[PDB]
Design a binder for this molecule. Structure first.
Ligand code: HEC
Ligand code: HEC
Ligand code: HEC
Ligand code: HEC
Ligand code: HEC
Ligand code: HEC
Ligand code: HEC
Ligand code: HEC
Ligand code: HEC
Ligand code: HEC
Ligand code: HEC
Ligand code: HEC
Ligand code: HG1
Lengths: 497, 497, 497
């Protein structure tokens, strides 16, 4: 019996075929999905988690292998001579780095194995001398000569660069719940933050001045679920950054009195601290958890922030601005709690369409409401009501905090992730709930037995989801028993975390 | 009987508590809203309008009080010596300002009380000498020495910087209709524009070159309801600004022949005019009111714009571009009028869900349709149909004008605030109306008496709204009787404006 | 019988009048639409296609006429002397161009009619000497002296600058289907790309260094249907561009080793090639057509891209990144095919509201489902289901490709045009389909004969659409018979293309 592709083929006169064969498929209609080559993912869901093979660059300790065609054992200078031709910009970068140029060194006292590093740190020093045994480093290499910065980079808790990949990719519902090729960018964004030292000061220049700029953060620290770049950019600080970036001195260390305009790094890597999370009052799951940072119990952290602001402001002004945040955040949660009551009420009254049993199982293998304890809050493969709910708490409520934290007058109120966007989302949620309730009331009165449509449960994409193949004993709970890393409180973790 | 918080508490094992106590509330579910400390707002709705106390910085004439812990009467140089340590960037800014550095003065002839100002204008000159009686200035201070710029800053009409706060915060429906902490950024954005001289050339450098850049405007002149920054930025002018900003001479006055690339200030503060509103053809409520700026009655203003463009263009080309605006704007209103007919038709047929009596009262205390005379057009605490209507007229239709005015080919057509966004919004409006009509038709036929859900009327946020507490005699109509400021035509103004 | 305007007039106390008379119409409610002055459009739909007269600047060969008031025959230097006063920036630009300044010439060997061009190329050389017979050039002028660049500019296929206007304005459904003043920016954006040489290096400086910057492309290469600027900008390449733009050497030709940071022009105008389309693997209708660019048949193009990336990367790394694109793209089409099945299923079951006969005819004059062969896929004047479908394939699916092509980790996954936006759009589509099916099921059971509302078919804007006036013989099929340009496969082309 014909598939969608089969029928499309009969209509468009293009044969059905595999997506991967190079055919230009008209609106992709007659193409069949082919699973890409995978490698096994790590972590507690290693029984089914996959990665694309290009994970080799980002978790090289577990995936890196020789894939070079060039043979030989070479000295540093030979690496440079050939790569001047073969990858010129890498050499140009390296020649403009302190590693490759003594002229710009600052005599900071770098040591390896207790001995001063006075030579060039060349290609072979970081990648190995044998071209068939090249190394793809992590912070572990950098630790050899930069232990202070590495220790700090490794000092964060859950929600920091430190466990971005190990915990918050490998344990994370939205990542583990999707086909690997859909979420490659998630693995890499989070893995760059954790495993590398090049997220802010990029290879191969490794220039701290570059790392001080907002461009060192905004590729990752952006978007609908954590819009801090946009919040910063739409503050007067951000406008002044844009106004002054071209002519200001970026060569100054991030210290009181060295900058007129504060950047991400100025406020979050104060005095060059490589554990930027630590200045935060408390981890709040991106502002989805409500906390009044101006409460007496958080006075030390609030006072610290006020003192940071006092580099360039009255501390009274700074205190007032952070109180505005506290107040704005508290007001924002009234709208979320309204939304949550409406949404859960629909579920409890059994009027959500689809109900959980009418959707594909969640990534746990459960037919459980996403906005209930044990559920999987999400924006995909779920009801419209649940999607809107997730958007309310994650995209909007969380970002109200970010808007206030970063002094974006517009995004606190009108703009993306604002009070007024919350208002509109709340209307949408109530609209969905109202529709659901009216349909159910009508169907009950006329004795129409409504069944949710099959497209909520099955489809070309839905059928790929891991929920379908979850089975008892498929969780590596020993991973969750580990105490050397934090963990996410997943429903099927099976142990104490 | 249990509240949402109570039930959540029983499920999540986290006690109910006040939002402000510092507890990290899981999804904010068990937190209770606590009203922040307020001060009374000013204006015609002073009987219930509130502000957060941090309004002290932005309407200091009515709210500023001593809040310093430092005592003493100091000379200018003493301010500097201590603040070099205590707020270094303020001192650094000031030292780089003409106020604090004679070397960059231009001999413009500044006078105070008819006498030339030849000395430094120091911290104490602007803030006072007594640290327990420090002053937080407005344009009134600046007027002492810069009467021309101040007079112009104070010469605008409604819709200008001049009355941004006094009228368009204190009289404005969306501001007065919401809890104060929700709209702090509104008060401050508008108050910075009105009461300060630092919106464009920031303190403490007060650098006109900074004020010439689009960064001097875009923090405020952005977003879904007035997207002129995005419109400018997505024009060739805006692209050239980005291309040339780093190397161009920003030290030149905004005059014909001094710039290749026009900025906001170039076109709207022509020849340094500090009443930027005046170059506009006519105030149109952000493009929500339809006016053909190319009509004979507006020839003087159109000719003036053409002559401005002629700094760098054929006047025929400029005339053609502004005619494109006129035509594009006129076409855009056909879609709004379509939407309005659909929406009002739903109300007149009584098929909106909720109907106004099913929602919380509007900020006037009325159960009145928002898109009818006397109603309160809005995006919050209203029906989905009404929300979509407001979005159509304000977010989209108004911004089509901005897209054309600023030569954004993309945003005129495809992009944010465009013709095609209007198209999609119109489909959405018709979709909502269609759903409403189908439900009503079904319910009528089967004799189901539909009542709008209680969540349209009551909820944790909805219950905070001022509409609930409005009562006869709660408007200060004497404020509206004032002829020394313009006014908004509010439904409960009670007098002639 | 009263129109909307008539009724509004009785309520607001503002007379009905033509939109163009200069009246400030309250919410545009009582204004009547007046058709702007048009000129006839060119192309196969010339029988009804219109343009605003300002098309004169963009298709000057067919529309340019004298419109100057200045008389005289002048020498180059006289043009300059007067225009120094009359249009100073044009002269300033020209004086800073190689055309107007021998000092910055590079001796490249420019010839006209086989003879070296050693003089200044002045205003009169490009525009003519007679001020009543001034010329408005296209690439045809530039060809006189820059044949190589012009030939390349003219070497592209469909989907390139080369036919942007001639084919993809004049034959394009969304353009020909709308009133001319609505889509002026479409005509001009596409005409600037095709007919001019100033899209990237603007007049009158014609500076290649400017053309190398992303600002040379992003005014056009942006937005919801082709967001490559945003994709680039949210890649590490884009962040580094922003970090380095102010201080980097933009005077270097776009060659291996000359740049650390790649721009649009670096990758798509490799070695100064003025046919940027040619580096693309295959034209895929902006990613709406599915093709695996990593398939064996595309090896040459894939290898070429890998070698380009190898300017600054391992070719293995580059190969891996482009494989990530292939995989991400293939996954993205599963969601589109899901959506398409749901949407077409609704049509085949006759439950779309409106059905095509309930909407205004499409621009062909047909009452045909937009997402069926022969239909007109669109976001306007169609059902909500069809609008959402178009958004899914065009705005989202197409941009997933762009997100991967440009290394935007965030926009591949979370952001604009991402996997997760596809997820949410798919929920929306299923939500619309579910609603449609539930209404139809209820109406069938209770014997309610539902007719789609008249507002789907008629309205102030809908009534302006060309579909209403289409008639047999109104297509210039001789245009489509042309073999010297490619064509769009329009339903009423009437001949082989
Ligand atoms: C240590 C200080 C390094 C030196 C010296 C050089 N490289 Fe490097 N390189 C380094 C790291 C830590 C990484 C991993 C990625 C990251 O950002 O952390 C890399 C990566 C590469 C790659 C692959 C990535 C790519 O862009 O293709 C190549 C091909 C590479 N490095 C080559 C290279 C050459 C030729 C060098 C000498 C001129 C060189 N590297 C210096 C760390 C270090
Ligand atoms: C100082 C003026 C800041 C600048 C510049 C930027 N941010 Fe910030 N950030 C700042 C504050 C006062 C806060 C609230 C912290 C508190 O505990 O009160 C934040 C918050 C964040 C967060 C969340 C941190 C947390 O929840 O603990 C992030 C991830 C963040 N900021 C990132 C960030 C980026 C990327 C910035 C540049 C674009 C940036 N911040 C600017 C202070 C300041
Ligand atoms: C962004 C979050 C960063 C990450 C991740 C890493 N570094 Fe960094 N680094 C960053 C900034 C903003 C600065 C300048 C800080 C300042 O005070 O101005 C730096 C600086 C360094 C330095 C120079 C130290 C010195 O004594 O001058 C080194 C040696 C350094 N960084 C190393 C380093 C290592 C080893 C990292 C991984 C563990 C690493 N950095 C990550 C920003 C960021
Ligand atoms: C960079 C381009 C990112 C991509 C892609 C993904 N996310 Fe992310 N993540 C990013 C940042 C900067 C932040 C921190 C914001 C803050 O205020 O802390 C986040 C955080 C989330 C977290 C925490 C969510 C929580 O418990 O509240 C997790 C678990 C997470 N990110 C994982 C993750 C994965 C795997 C993604 C794809 C499925 C997703 N992120 C996209 C930026 C990066
Ligand atoms: C007049 C020309 C001024 C001089 C000289 C100095 N300041 Fe000022 N300051 C001025 C104004 C008009 C304002 C109000 C805010 C605005 O933008 O209009 C301020 C503000 C302050 C503040 C509070 C705001 C903050 O950022 O914390 C402080 C603490 C302050 N000013 C201090 C200060 C010092 C120490 C000065 C001498 C070095 C100084 N100001 C000069 C106007 C003027
Ligand atoms: C000249 C090339 C301009 C530049 C640069 C910017 N704007 Fe503009 N603006 C311009 C015109 C011709 C118009 C239409 C005015 C008319 O009467 O025809 C506008 C409109 C505005 C408005 C609305 C003004 C009104 O309705 O009276 C605002 C608020 C505005 N522009 C702001 C603005 C900003 C913030 C800009 C930089 C980002 C900017 N404009 C650029 C001309 C030009
Ligand atoms: C943005 C809307 C501004 C506001 C609000 C204020 N100023 Fe301004 N100022 C602005 C610009 C763009 C410029 C340069 C204009 C030009 O022609 O290039 C200026 C300049 C000044 C100057 C210098 C005047 C001179 O003779 O050189 C002064 C003294 C000045 N501005 C003062 C001033 C005052 C007192 C303000 C509040 C009343 C004020 N400015 C507001 C932009 C803007
Ligand atoms: C700066 C960050 C703003 C915030 C926050 C708010 N608005 Fe605003 N306002 C802003 C600008 C630049 C404009 C002018 C746009 C133009 O084309 O004129 C506006 C204008 C509105 C107006 C006029 C609306 C009308 O009658 O048509 C008012 C009444 C208004 N703004 C008030 C207001 C308040 C109080 C806000 C929160 C409730 C809101 N604005 C956000 C920019 C600033
Ligand atoms: C050829 C190399 C040129 C020279 C020398 C000058 N101009 Fe030009 N101009 C040229 C072209 C190809 C165009 C069409 C637009 C495009 O971008 O392709 C133009 C346009 C104009 C216009 C109208 C457009 C406008 O911005 O108003 C004018 C008024 C104009 N040009 C005037 C002008 C003057 C005075 C010149 C000498 C100083 C001059 N141009 C030089 C190409 C060329
Ligand atoms: C190199 C690092 C690039 C930069 C910088 C930019 N783009 Fe790109 N683009 C690049 C690749 C590898 C691809 C995929 C091509 C393939 O066949 O695999 C693309 C794609 C595009 C397209 C579509 C081309 C097509 O489908 O044939 C466009 C229109 C495009 N890119 C434009 C563009 C712009 C405007 C950029 C700057 C903002 C830009 N690209 C950057 C490589 C690179
Ligand atoms: C963007 C897509 C462009 C369009 C359209 C046109 N040009 Fe261009 N041009 C562009 C770039 C990025 C560059 C620099 C390329 C490099 O290798 O760095 C150029 C350069 C030129 C030159 C200089 C050639 C030389 O020998 O140095 C010329 C003479 C030139 N361009 C002419 C030209 C003409 C005639 C065009 C229309 C047919 C044209 N360009 C369009 C970018 C773009
Ligand atoms: C510049 C400001 C644009 C506007 C306005 C319009 N479009 Fe466009 N068009 C633009 C670009 C950069 C691209 C290329 C993207 C790529 O990846 O190739 C497009 C492409 C479309 C195409 C092809 C659609 C197809 O068959 O798949 C056409 C037909 C098209 N553009 C036409 C067109 C018209 C006439 C518009 C208004 C109705 C529309 N575009 C807006 C950028 C420009
Ligand atoms: O369930 C969570 C975190 C929820 C994370 C979000 C869930 C919804 C969207 C994706 C991220 N917990 C345990 C709650 O009992 C987090 C805890 C916090 O203190 C941190 O860790």
């Amino acid at each position: 019996g014909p598939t969608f592709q089969d029928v499309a083929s009969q209509v468009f006169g293009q044969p059905v075929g595999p997506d991967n064969d190079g055919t230009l498929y008209i609106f992709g209609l007659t193409a069949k999905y082919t699973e890409p080559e995978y490698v096994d993912g790590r972590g507690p869901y290693k029984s089914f988690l996959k990665m694309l093979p290009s994970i080799r660059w980002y978790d090289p300790e577990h995936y890196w292998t020789n894939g070079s065609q060039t043979e030989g054992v070479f000295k540093n200078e030979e690496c440079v001579l050939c790569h001047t031709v073969q990858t010129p910009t890498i050499v140009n970068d390296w020649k403009q780095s302190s590693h490759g140029s003594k002229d710009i060194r600052r005599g900071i006292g770098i040591k390896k194995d207790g001995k001063p590093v006075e030579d060039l740190v060349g290609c072979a020093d970081c990648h190995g001398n044998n071209h068939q045994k090249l190394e793809m480093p992590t912070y572990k290499l950098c630790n050899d000569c930069h232990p202070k910065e590495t220790a700090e980079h490794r000092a964060g808790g859950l929600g920091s660069h430190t466990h971005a990949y190990t915990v918050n990719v490998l344990e994370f519902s939205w990542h583990v719940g999707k086909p690997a090729e859909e979420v490659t960018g998630c693995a890499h964004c989070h893995a760059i933050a954790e495993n590398r030292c090049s997220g802010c000061h990029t290879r191969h220049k490794f220039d701290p001045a570059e790392a001080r700029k907002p461009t060192a953060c905004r590729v990752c620290h952006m978007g609908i679920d954590h819009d801090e770049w946009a919040m910063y950019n739409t503050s007067i600080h951000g406008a002044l950054y844009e106004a002054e970036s071209a002519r200001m001195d970026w060569g100054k260390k991030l210290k009181k009195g060295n900058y007129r305009v504060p950047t991400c790094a100025y406020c979050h890597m104060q005095n060059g601290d490589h554990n930027p999370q630590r200045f935060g009052t408390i981890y709040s799951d991106m502002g989805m958890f409500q906390v009044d940072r101006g409460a007496p119990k958080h006075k030390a952290k609030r006072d610290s922030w006020i003192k940071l602001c006092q580099d360039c402001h009255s501390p009274r002004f700074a205190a007032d601005k952070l109180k505005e945040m506290d107040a704005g955040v508290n007001l924002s949660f009234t709208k979320w709690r309204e939304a949550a009551a409406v949404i859960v009420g629909c579920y409890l009254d059994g009027v959500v369409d689809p109900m959980p049993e009418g959707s594909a199982p969640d990534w746990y293998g459960h037919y459980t409401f996403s906005l209930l304890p044990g559920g999987d809050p999400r924006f995909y493969a779920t009801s419209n009501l649940e999607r809107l709910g997730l958007e309310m708490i994650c995209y909007l409520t969380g970002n109200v905090y970010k808007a206030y934290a970063h002094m974006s007058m517009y995004n606190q109120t009108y703009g993306n992730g604002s009070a007024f966007e919350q208002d509109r989302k709340l209307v949408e949620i109530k609209t969905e709930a109202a529709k659901l309730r009216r349909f159910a009331a009508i169907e009950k009165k006329i004795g129409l037995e409504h069944k949710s449509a099959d497209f909520w449960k099955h489809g070309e994409y839905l059928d790929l989801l891991p929920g379908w193949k979850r089975k008892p004993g498929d969780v590596d709970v020993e991973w969750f028993k580990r105490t050397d890393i934090p963990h996410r409180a997943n429903a099927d973790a099976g142990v104490e975390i």
